[PDB]
Amino acid sequence: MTTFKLIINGKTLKGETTTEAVDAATAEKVFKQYANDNGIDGEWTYDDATKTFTVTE
Incomplete structure (x- = not known):
């Protein structure tokens, strides 16, 4: 499987x-x-460099 990271x-x-x-x-x-x-509706971005969902609220 693909281990993603948020x-x-x-x-x-x-x-x-x-x-x-x-x-x-x-x-x-x-x-x-x-x-x-929890309430993290920041700005999601998927970095293909290392697969990691990056939100920021």
């Missing part, structure tokens, strides 16, 4: 998290539910 540049949390998704098509569905729950 950064936490939000005003409620901070650090890093990982998961197990076949590709960004499923990684965002899991990372989005995580950020959407």
